[PDB]
């Protein structure tokens, strides 16, 4: 049957920090993209 | 406390055959790249563990035979050897403990 | 009780009353001992009335094994294949005669619960009742609370 | 004392015909006089039940009990006798079909309470039964979905007829 | 209620617990390898870290000398700790004493573990090595990294 | 080469393949015993007594344990790649491999080739019967590439449309449905003559068979079958088809300044069940595989 | 110990009964049992049917060719020569064919004189079902003639049983008059159709096609379906009533869960009403002229 | 509350007849063979009637003289005994022994064969079924060596008669479940064997019983097994494997 698994199981010693940095930059960019909601398409106040 | 009646076999079955008391089936059993004697995740293999324990026991036996009596503890590092293998230049101040068997492939 | 013994339905073996009536009983294997005080009734029966019982209905064969035993028994097989074995241990001639007459009159069905003594094959004649019976139909079958 | 489980491996079958299936094998083996409790042996058997022999060995090797190693050795010797005598070639094509536990002969001892009274110490003993069948293990029974329940309910509502008349 | 509190009790009190931890620390300094329950080896590692730190801080200090004389009931282990294990970790800070978990014991079936210092003249334990950097997932990650590096 | 319905051609293909397999299995007289040795690392010094042209390495692994059957993709026979479903001939030595090994390269190549063949099989049955389709080849792309490609030639009437996301979702659903059913990768060392005689329809397949048979003097190709589909590939493949746990095709790219007609090139990414990742890495590999990648030179 | 013997004997008999009940032995034919007589059984079977059979015809019809082949194989594999009775057994083939033809023509004549509105396919399927294997096997098993049939295989395949049934029918036809055998086959075959539905013995595929064909043969235009009553159209248990109207006139009606099965039932009811084989028809007159 | 377990026995047959007793054991056979017969190397090539004589025919004449003096001894001990019809007797005895082994017969096989070859023919076949049958005999059987011993242990002598045999057999060994395992169905294969018969001469009755069978080292290999045989290596204990 299917066994338990996580995200850092089948990764080498030079891929875990790379994936961490990549996902960190990704979430930081996603948080910075939603900084000016008024200049986009705001709902009528 | 004292029961007023007697529990039935149906109640006993419902109490002892419930999935809460039954042993759960674990899914953490895999194989080992070396030797291979059925290991488990996050747990070291018993075969290599027994091997390294026997090796450490033999090394301690040799150390005790070289030291002799108790209350010693040298102030220098130690290094073990095997059949042949001349001591290197950076291992002059270290205690040499040679064995009487070939060097294994898992000890470098 | 009825919840501990199996039951069946009341029906014919091959519709005897419709076409022609046939004899359900076939063979009658009697076991009368040679010497003993437990088969006197069976001995007297085979002596006096077995000929009349065989001549009454030609469709029934009577077998007299005459095996020296202790309990006289009788085997009655029917057309369906049922075998009812009863013992005539210490019985008079009239009792054995009534027993064999009742065995010849009955068929091979079980003597369990009858379950509904009346049985018909065409129960519906003037149409079986349905919930839509005795209900008039409206114009174009228009359901209530509609506009068209 | 009765012994009828170790003798089932001697039932000889007549030679089959070319137009007959393969028919899986049946291997019976059990030990007698085992210092253990019947409830724990039955718990282990319920843990095993119908699984592969390798999976059962893997689960028993990491099972922290007293009878785990006993059942492991029983399965090992049964597989060995099957591949040596019962004409079995594949070692991983086996599965446990039946696995139960029994009760062994008991003795009587004393308990010594806190007064002149005492108890009856009954030495609890048990056994262990297991049967090995060749071929792949059968898949477990899948749970019936809503379609099966709907079909069963429709069949039940269609099977009902008129009652208490004719 | 034990919120934010460690200090796992073992003996009949704090004194017995400290004595057992000192005995375990002495055994670990001597033999460099001890199998014991997970809590015991965890506390032993936690104390050995600070022991190595204090031994590295200096030798002529009276505080470290008294601590080494108290936590070592064999006396001969003090010069060894001050002249071998202290100059060895001169380039490291607090990165040592690796902990590895073993299955169970063949007596009461208890969770145990084995810890040891770095280097170690004894053969190393079979470390749980990760997967090689040549599998499908690792090769795909390396390709994606090279692609994002060339595209940047 | 004549007008044939989209059923009788695969019917004759599969029955000719069955006749060829029957001839191959009946060419040997009785059962010759071989002595195959295990020169692995886990259980060294193990010799097996198997049959000739009948026994398979999967049956040999079944003699060990279930782990050797659950964690086995490709076998090593005298340094040559051998799949798990292929009869042996002479006596030699065998070695099992896995994905989590030292140098997993041959297993990765076999997995990529199997995924490409499965994509071709699932895409060759998802078009209109009025529109003829052709299968060019499956170029061996390295593991560093984003996704494997498979050139498919469509009809001349469809040289201006682009498949949206609905077609991709339908293709992924069909691939998952094909993975759900357990169908082995039955292969056979079929002679190149009968191999090219069975087809005699698509010129691309004939040219591919000629190019793959012109490299060896024995004129022996490697044909595979997935239930009822025959394709020409290089080297061995994977045993079971249930290894692929996550299967999803990316996009499609069309190359024009290379041939007058318009040809299609579909891509896709797949991950086995033993090396499954999280959803984040999954979408990352899905977005990265949508780019154009080619390694034909 | 407990002194006794009668209670021990009863307990041993109970043990033997439990043994024979848990492990049922293979049943043996009635001919190999001690209490058995072939001539007596033949006479009983001839006298129980209220007829006048003959010994030679019954002994010729109650055998089979497979039985003769088995007997000659057994007499040749051992060495005993028995050519003074085996060569005069006479197989029951021509008599079986004559009885089959007589039964078929009598059933067709009865279905023609009783149901004039029956088409050719209808009467053909009816006479095929009445001469089917299941009905004749059930009749032969209820008449206790399987134990008298000399043939191999204890369960007796349906082919041999139907063959010997047709053989004894032909023997009864050759012995007594045609009217006696006609009444016999009537009372032993037509009584099975009591309470059975028409299409259960016919098993058609498209009732609407045959219905519109019969209507075109009756100078009728074309039927059309209309929804009469309904109850529950959105629930899981729907009920509909489709009524077939021909020239603004209702002819039949059929219920159903959906509309397709309702129209099919209505077409079946209309086709059964057009053939005259309904539930309100005249029952078969089981009397003598 | 003071009870234990009884039933203390062992499953091993030790020595107990000759431990302080006056009753010995009257055997009816011996251990193995007296002298191993060496068939010629060119037996399969010269399987016809006869051929040209080889050089130095003294050894064959000496063997013939030994056989003749052994026949003279066994005739002086017990008269009225032929030699020409002895191969036919051995052939029919072998045939009836194989037939009773096929029909699962023991009370007759015990007296048909000796006490030595019975376990070798009843051990690895007790839980299996055989379909052996004789079809046709090819080359007639002949006697190749006649020897006899003179062991004076208990005053019992024996006369092993090595008689070759060449015919065609049909072997069909199934399994205890009904499936095939070793031989096929009706297959008229060709195989030869050297069977020796031993008879207890000092017995007041004496029956010619099959002693054993000797296989030459140059015999062709037997038919392969229909299944797959696994040969695992030794158990790798925590050390090292050098092989
Ligand atoms: Mg405590
Ligand atoms: Zn290991």
Curated annotation (Swiss-Prot), chain A:
* Residue stretches spanning the membrane: none
The record's subcellular locations are: Mitochondrion
Domain of life according to the entry: Eukaryota
* Disease implication from the record: Combined oxidative phosphorylation deficiency 9: A mitochondrial disease characterized by failure to thrive, poor feeding, hypertrophic cardiomyopathy, hepatomegaly, and psychomotor retardation. Death in infancy has been observed in some cases.
Question: To which protein family does this belong?
Answer: Belongs to the universal ribosomal protein uL3 family.
**Subunit structure, per the record?**
Component of the mitochondrial large ribosomal subunit (mt-LSU). Mature mammalian 55S mitochondrial ribosomes consist of a small (28S) and a large (39S) subunit. The 28S small subunit contains a 12S ribosomal RNA (12S mt-rRNA) and 30 different proteins. The 39S large subunit contains a 16S rRNA (16S mt-rRNA), a copy of mitochondrial valine transfer RNA (mt-tRNA(Val)), which plays an integral structural role, and 52 different proteins.
Instruction: Provide the protein name.
Output: Large ribosomal subunit protein uL3m
Gene behind this chain? MRPL3
Q: Which residues of the full protein are shown?
A: 43 to 87 of 348
Swiss-Prot record, chain B:
Q: Name one GO molecular function term.
A: RNA binding
Tell me which family the UniProt entry assigns to this protein. Answer: Belongs to the bacterial ribosomal protein bL32 family.
In this chain, the stretch annotated as Disordered covers 86-108
Compositional bias segments (type: Basic and acidic residues): 91-103
Q: What does this protein do?
A: Component of the mitochondrial large ribosomal subunit (mt-LSU). The mitochondrial ribosome (mitoribosome) is a large ribonucleoprotein complex responsible for the synthesis of proteins inside mitochondria.
Q: Where does Zn(2+) bind?
A: 32, 35, 45, 48
Keyword flag Mitochondrion: yes
- Keywords attached to this entry: Mitochondrion, Ribonucleoprotein, Ribosomal protein, Transit peptide
Q: Which GO terms describe its cellular component?
A: mitochondrial inner membrane; mitochondrial large ribosomal subunit; mitochondrial matrix; mitochondrial ribosome; mitochondrion
In the record, biological process GO terms are:
mitochondrial translation; translation
Q: What is this protein called?
A: Large ribosomal subunit protein bL32m
Q: How is it modified after translation?
A: MRPL32 precursor is processed by the m-AAA protease (composed of AFG3L2 and SPG7), which cleaves the N-terminal transit peptide. Cleavage by the m-AAA protease takes place prior to assembly into the large subunit, an essential step for mitochondrial ribosome (mitoribosome) assembly. Proper processing by the m-AAA protease is dependent on the zinc-binding region within the tightly folded C-terminal domain of MRPL32: zinc-dependent folding halts degradation initiated from the N-terminus and triggers the release of mature MRPL32.
Residue window of the full protein shown: 79 to 186 of 188
List the taxonomic lineage.
Eukaryota, Metazoa, Chordata, Craniata, Vertebrata
Swiss-Prot record, chain C:
What family, per the record?
A: Belongs to the mitochondrion-specific ribosomal protein mL43 family.
A biological process (GO) of this protein is: translation
Q: How does it assemble?
A: Component of the mitochondrial large ribosomal subunit (mt-LSU). Mature mammalian 55S mitochondrial ribosomes consist of a small (28S) and a large (39S) subunit. The 28S small subunit contains a 12S ribosomal RNA (12S mt-rRNA) and 30 different proteins. The 39S large subunit contains a 16S rRNA (16S mt-rRNA), a copy of mitochondrial valine transfer RNA (mt-tRNA(Val)), which plays an integral structural role, and 52 different proteins.
MF GO annotations: RNA binding; structural constituent of ribosome
Q: Which N-terminal stretch is annotated as signal sequence?
A: none
- Give the residues of the full protein shown: 2 to 149 of 215
Q: Which cysteines link up through disulfide bonds? A: none
Keywords from the UniProt entry: Mitochondrion, Ribonucleoprotein, Ribosomal protein, Transit peptide
User: Which protein are we looking at?
Assistant: Large ribosomal subunit protein mL43
UniProtKB/Swiss-Prot annotation, chain G:
Q: What is this protein called?
A: Large ribosomal subunit protein mL44
Database matches in Gene3D superfamilies: 3.30.160.20, Ribonuclease III domain
**Which lineage is the organism of this entry classified under, starting from the top rank?**
Eukaryota, Metazoa, Chordata, Craniata, Vertebrata
Q: What does this protein do?
A: Component of the 39S subunit of mitochondrial ribosome. May have a function in the assembly/stability of nascent mitochondrial polypeptides exiting the ribosome.
- Cite the SUPFAM superfamilies for this sequence: dsRNA-binding domain-like, RNase III domain-like
Predominant place of localization: mitochondrion
Recorded hits in InterPro entries, A to Z, give: dsRBD_dom (IPR014720), Ribosomal_mL44_DSRM_metazoa (IPR044444), RM44_endonuclase (IPR055189), RNase_III_sf (IPR036389)
Q: Which UniProt keywords apply?
A: Disease variant, Endonuclease, Hydrolase, Mitochondrion, Nuclease, Primary mitochondrial disease, Ribonucleoprotein, Ribosomal protein, RNA-binding, Transit peptide
Q: What Pfam families does the record point to?
A: DSRM_MRPL44, RM44_endonuclase
């Amino acid at each position: 049957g299917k066994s338990g698994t996580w995200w850092d199981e089948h990764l080498s010693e030079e891929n875990v920090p790379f994936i961490k940095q990549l996902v960190s930059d990704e979430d930081k960019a996603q948080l910075a993209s939603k900084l000016c909601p008024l200049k986009d398409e705001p709902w009528p106040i | 406390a004292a029961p007023k009646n007697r529990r039935t076999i149906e109640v006993n079955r419902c109490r002892r055959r419930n999935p809460q008391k039954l042993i759960k089936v674990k899914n953490n059993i895999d194989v080992c790249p070396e030797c291979g004697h059925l290991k488990q995740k996050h747990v070291l293999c018993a075969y290599c563990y027994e091997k390294v324990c026997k090796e450490t026991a033999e090394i301690r036996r040799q150390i005790g035979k070289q030291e002799g009596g108790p209350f010693k503890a040298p102030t220098i590092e130690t290094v073990v050897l095997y059949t042949g293998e001349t001591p290197s230049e950076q291992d002059q101040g270290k205690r040499i403990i040679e064995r009487d068997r070939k060097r294994p492939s898992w000890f470098t | 009780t009825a919840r501990g013994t199996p039951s069946r339905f009341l029906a014919s073996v091959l519709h005897n009353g419709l076409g022609r009536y046939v004899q359900q009983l076939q063979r009658l294997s009697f076991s009368v001992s040679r010497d003993g005080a437990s088969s006197r009734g069976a001995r007297e029966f085979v002596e006096r009335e077995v000929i009349d019982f065989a001549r009454r209905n030609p469709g029934v064969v009577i077998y007299v094994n005459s095996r020296p035993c202790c309990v006289p028994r009788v085997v009655a097989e029917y057309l369906n294949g049922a075998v009812r074995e009863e013992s005539i241990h210490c019985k008079s001639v009239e009792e054995i005669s009534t027993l064999v007459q009742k065995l010849a009159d009955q068929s091979g069905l079980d003597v369990i619960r009858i379950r509904k003594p009346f049985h018909t094959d065409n129960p519906s004649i003037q149409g079986q009742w349905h919930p839509f019976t005795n209900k008039p139909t409206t114009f174009r079958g228009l359901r209530p609370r509609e506009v068209q | 004392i009765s012994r009828k489980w170790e003798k089932k491996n001697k039932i000889v079958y007549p030679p089959q015909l070319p137009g007959e299936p393969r028919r899986p094998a049946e291997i019976y083996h059990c030990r007698r006089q085992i210092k253990y409790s019947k409830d724990k042996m039955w718990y282990l058997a319920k843990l095993i039940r119908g699984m592969s022999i390798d999976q059962a060995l893997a689960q028993l090797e990491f099972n922290d009990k007293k009878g785990a190693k006993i059942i492991k050795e029983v399965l090992l010797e049964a597989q060995d006798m099957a591949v040596r005598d019962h004409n079995v070639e594949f070692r991983s094509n086996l599965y446990i079909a039946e696995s139960t536990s029994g009760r062994g002969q008991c003795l009587k001892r004393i308990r010594y309470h806190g007064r002149g009274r005492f108890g009856i110490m009954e030495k609890v003993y048990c056994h262990y039964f297991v049967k090995l069948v060749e071929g792949p293990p059968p898949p477990p029974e899948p749970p019936k979905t809503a379609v099966a329940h709907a079909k069963e309910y429709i069949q039940q509502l269609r099977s009902r007829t008129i009652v208490h008349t004719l | 209620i034990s919120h934010g509190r460690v200090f796992r009790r073992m003996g009949l009190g704090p004194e017995s617990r400290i004595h057992l931890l000192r005995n375990l620390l002495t055994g670990l300094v001597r033999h460099e390898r001890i199998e014991a329950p997970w809590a015991r080896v965890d506390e032993m590692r936690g104390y050995a870290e600070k022991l190595i730190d204090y031994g590295k801080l200096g030798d002529t200090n009276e505080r470290a000398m008294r601590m080494a004389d108290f936590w070592l009931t064999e006396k001969d282990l003090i010069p060894k700790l001050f002249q071998v294990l202290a100059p060895r970790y001169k380039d490291q800070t607090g990165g040592y004493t690796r902990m590895l978990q073993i299955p169970n014991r063949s007596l009461d079936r208890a969770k145990m573990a084995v810890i040891e210092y770095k280097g170690n003249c004894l053969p190393p334990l079979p470390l749980p090595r990760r997967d090689s950097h040549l599998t499908l997932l690792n090769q795909l990650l390396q390709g994606l990294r090279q692609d994002l590096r060339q595209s940047q | 080469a004549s007008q044939l319905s989209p059923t009788e051609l695969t019917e004759m293909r599969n029955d000719l393949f069955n006749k060829e397999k029957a001839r191959q299995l009946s060419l040997t007289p009785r059962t010759e015993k071989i002595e195959v040795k295990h020169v692995g690392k886990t259980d060294p010094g193990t010799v097996f007594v198997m049959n000739k042209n009948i026994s398979t390495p999967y049956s040999c692994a079944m003699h060990l344990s279930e782990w050797y059957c659950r964690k086995s993709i490709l076998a090593l026979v005298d340094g040559q790649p051998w799949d798990m479903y292929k009869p042996l001939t002479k006596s030699c030595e065998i070695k099992f491999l896995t994905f989590k090994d030292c140098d997993p390269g041959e297993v990765n190549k076999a997995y990529w080739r199997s995924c490409a063949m499965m994509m071709g099989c699932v895409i060759e049955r998802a078009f209109k019967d009025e529109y003829m389709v052709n299968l060019v080849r499956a170029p061996e792309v390295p593991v560093i590439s984003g996704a494997f490609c498979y050139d498919v030639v469509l009809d001349s009437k469809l040289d201006e449309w682009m498949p949206t996301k609905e077609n991709l979702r339908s293709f992924t659903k069909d691939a998952h449905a094909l993975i759900y059913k357990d169908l082995p990768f039955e292969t056979l060392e079929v002679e190149a003559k009968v191999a090219l005689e069975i087809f005699q329809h698509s010129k691309y397949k004939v040219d591919f068979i000629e190019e793959k048979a012109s490299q060896n003097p024995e004129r022996i190709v490697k044909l595979h079958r997935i239930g009822d589909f025959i394709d020409v590939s290089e080297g061995p493949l994977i045993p079971r088809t249930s290894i692929c746990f996550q299967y999803e095709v990316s996009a499609v790219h069309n190359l024009q300044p290379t041939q007058p007609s318009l040809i299609r090139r579909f891509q896709g990414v797949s991950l086995p069940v033993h090396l499954r990742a999280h959803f984040t890495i999954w979408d990352k590999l899905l977005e990265r595989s949508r780019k154009m990648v080619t390694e034909d030179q | 110990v407990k002194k006794g013997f009668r209670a021990a004997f009863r307990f041993q008999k109970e043990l033997e009964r439990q043994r024979l009940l848990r492990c049922p032995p293979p049943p043996v034919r009635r001919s190999e049992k001690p209490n058995w007589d072939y001539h007596a059984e033949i006479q009983a079977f001839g006298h129980r049917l209220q007829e006048n059979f003959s010994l030679d015809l019954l002994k010729t019809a109650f055998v089979n060719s497979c039985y003769i082949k088995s007997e000659e194989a057994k007499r040749q594999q051992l060495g005993i020569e028995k050519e003074a009775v085996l060569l005069n057994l006479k197989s029951n083939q021509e008599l079986s064919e004559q009885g089959t033809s007589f039964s078929q023509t009598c059933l067709t004549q009865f279905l023609e004189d009783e149901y004039p509105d029956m088409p050719t396919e209808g009467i053909k399927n009816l006479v095929d079902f009445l001469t089917g294997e299941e009905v004749v096997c059930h009749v032969a098993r209820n008449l206790a003639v399987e134990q008298l049939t000399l043939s191999e295989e204890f369960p007796v395949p349906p082919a041999v049983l139907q063959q010997t049934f047709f053989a004894v029918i032909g023997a009864l036809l050759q012995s007594s008059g045609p009217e006696r055998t006609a009444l016999f086959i009537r009372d032993f075959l037509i009584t099975q159709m009591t309470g059975k539905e028409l299409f259960e013995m016919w098993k058609i595929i498209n009732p609407m096609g045959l219905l519109v064909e019969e209507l075109k043969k009756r100078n009728v235009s074309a039927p059309e379906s209309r929804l009469t009553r309904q109850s529950g159209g959105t629930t899981a248990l729907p009920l509909y009533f489709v009524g077939l109207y021909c020239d603004k006139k209702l002819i039949a009606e059929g219920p159903g869960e959906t509309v397709l099965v309702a129209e099919e039932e209505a077409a079946r009811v209309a086709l059964r009403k057009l053939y005259g084989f309904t539930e309100n028809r005249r029952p078969w007159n089981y009397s003598k002229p | 509350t003071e009870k234990e377990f009884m039933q203390h026995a062992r499953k091993a047959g030790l020595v107990i007849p000759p431990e302080k007793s006056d009753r010995s054991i009257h055997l009816a056979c011996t251990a193995g063979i007296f002298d191993a017969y060496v068939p010629p190397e060119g037996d399969a090539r010269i399987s016809s009637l006869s051929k040209e004589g080889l050089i130095e025919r003294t050894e064959r004449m000496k063997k013939t003289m030994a056989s003749q003096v052994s026949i003279r001894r066994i005739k002086d001990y017990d008269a009225n005994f032929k030699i020409k019809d002895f191969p036919e007797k051995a052939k029919d005895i072998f045939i009836e022994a194989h037939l009773c082994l096929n029909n699962s017969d023991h009370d007759r096989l015990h007296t048909l064969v000796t006490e030595h070859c019975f376990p070798d023919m009843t051990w690895d076949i007790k839980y299996k079924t055989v379909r052996w049958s004789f079809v046709e005999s090819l080359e007639p059987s002949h006697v190749v060596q006649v020897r006899c011993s003179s062991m004076m242990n208990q005053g019992n002598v024996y006369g092993q008669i090595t008689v070759r045999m060449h015919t065609r057999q049909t072997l069909a060994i199934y399994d205890r479940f009904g499936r095939l395992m070793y031989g096929q169905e009706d297959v008229p294969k060709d195989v030869l064997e050297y069977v020796v018969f031993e008879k207890q001469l000092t017995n007041p009755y004496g029956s010619w019983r099959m002693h054993t069978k000797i296989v030459p080292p140059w015999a062709p290999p037997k038919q392969p097994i229909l299944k797959t045989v696994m040969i695992p290596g030794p158990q790798l204990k925590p050390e090292e494997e050098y092989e």
